[PDB]
């Protein structure tokens, strides 16, 4: 009598190139400060 099965759906988390893209884009400015500090120390 006891006989059952099932099928489950999968998830892709939440990376929709808006939070990923915003972090990636914002990380551009830091290079300017790196260059400025290097110039100052030279």
């Amino acid at each position: 009598n006891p006989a059952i099965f099932a099928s489950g759906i999968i998830m892709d988390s939440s990376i929709s190139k808006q939070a990923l893209s915003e972090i990636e884009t914002r990380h551009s400015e830091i290079i300017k400060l790196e260059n400025s500090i290097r110039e100052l120390h030279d």
Partner: peptide, 22 residues
């Protein structure tokens, strides 16, 4: 001064950044 980095992901890697920057 109230914050330096927004948390794209809730991971430890972000936290120290703020302090580091500070």
């Amino acid at each position: 001064s109230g914050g330096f980095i927004r948390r794209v992901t809730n991971d430890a890697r972000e936290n120290e950044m703020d302090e580091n920057l500070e």
